[PDB]
């Protein structure tokens, strides 16, 4: 039975790779949209809710100021993000619909996910119970199984990047650090609390950094705060590299065991990175109640369904300062963004 299930996974991932490759070796303009509201911000731009004027459908538009994408690793990453998002297809990955550029900005237009960020729901309620955290963790496990099978590393797992859809399921956003990596890669990037020790130590690293980050995410969902917690990044890094983890007293023993095997500094011991790959995680006792196929098929009733007041509703997002979108008469950085 479990063996038949594992043959079926191999069959699916073989088909998934064929479909990915066909798209990987292979659409609008700004005035086609009304800009409605800022949904989130970052050091290179913002994500806005927009309305497509012709169809009236709503979308999330990520706007990157080509000028602000200045540093070398910032531009390569932007190309990775667009090309990876156009080629992937998985139930828990946000769907890119358009991408285009103008004199000043780069634009990626994605489906709008109206339930808000896991981040704000978690911070409002404090922590998720273990079944609730498990439901989300299962979707990430399957998403990283998919990505990793395509030799894609994600590299920015955190609640800020996990949107809740109308059925209460996860949609992973922000592929800004995602990359095709057959073996190792060397960029020092990601979010401090979620970095694996080997990233912080300037060691060449592989997809096992995503499994470390899953341990951070599960811990943060179930505790309400992450395992390596300090006011400044250098203090966070020190805690990560020591790798000492203490757990809340309400964590089950099965959760602590799983987290000790994910938050493992020794790569020869880290779950997700061993002979049995992702199955050491999927077959762990903490996931014994998880019906992995039913999660993929979205047959499991979600622990939380966001309320939606209609299309274009932004009530599940925080408010941000709005700043007019200015497009220059002079094209900026044309040669550096030719492939976009």
């Amino acid at each position: 039975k479990k063996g038949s299930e594992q043959e079926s996974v191999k069959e699916f991932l073989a088909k998934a790779k064929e479909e990915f490759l066909k798209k990987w070796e292979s659409t609008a303009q700004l005035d086609h949209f009304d800009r409605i509201k800022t949904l989130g911000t970052g050091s290179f731009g913002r994500v806005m809710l927009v309305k497509h004027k012709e169809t009236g459908n709503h979308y999330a538009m990520k706007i990157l100021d080509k000028q602000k994408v200045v540093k070398l690793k910032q531009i390569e990453h932007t190309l990775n993000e667009k090309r990876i998002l156009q080629a992937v297809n998985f139930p828990f990955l946000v769907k890119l619909e358009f991408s285009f550029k103008d004199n000043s900005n780069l634009y990626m237009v994605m489906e709008y996910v109206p339930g808000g960020e896991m981040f704000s729901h978690l911070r409002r309620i404090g922590r998720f119970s273990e079944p609730h955290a498990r439901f989300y963790a299962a979707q990430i496990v399957l998403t990283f199984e998919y990505l990793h099978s395509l030799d894609l590393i994600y590299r920015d797992l955190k609640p800020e990047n996990l949107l809740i859809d109308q059925q209460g399921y996860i949609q992973v956003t922000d592929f800004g650090f995602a990359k095709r990596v057959k073996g190792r890669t060397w960029t020092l990037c990601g979010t401090p609390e979620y970095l694996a020790p080997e990233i912080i130590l300037s060691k060449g690293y592989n997809k096992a950094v995503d499994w470390w980050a899953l341990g951070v995410l599960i811990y943060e969902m179930a505790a309400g705060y992450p395992p390596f917690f300090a006011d400044q990044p250098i203090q966070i890094y020190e805690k990560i590299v020591s790798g000492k983890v203490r757990f809340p007293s309400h964590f089950s023993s099965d959760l602590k065991d799983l987290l000790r095997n994910l938050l493992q500094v020794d790569l020869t011991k880290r779950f997700g990175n061993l002979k049995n790959g992702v199955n050491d995680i999927k077959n762990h006792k903490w996931f014994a109640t998880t019906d992995w196929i039913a999660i993929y098929q979205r047959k499991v009733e979600a622990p939380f369904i966001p309320k939606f007041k209609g299309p274009g509703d932004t009530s599940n997002f925080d408010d941000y300062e709005e700043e007019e979108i200015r497009v220059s008469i002079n094209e900026k950085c044309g040669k550096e963004f030719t492939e976009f």
Partner: peptide, 14 residues
């Protein structure tokens, strides 16, 4: 137990 409770920005090169 003091740590960062708001949204966390990613770092690109350091």
């Amino acid at each position: 137990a003091a740590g960062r409770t708001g949204r966390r920005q990613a770092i690109h090169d350091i």
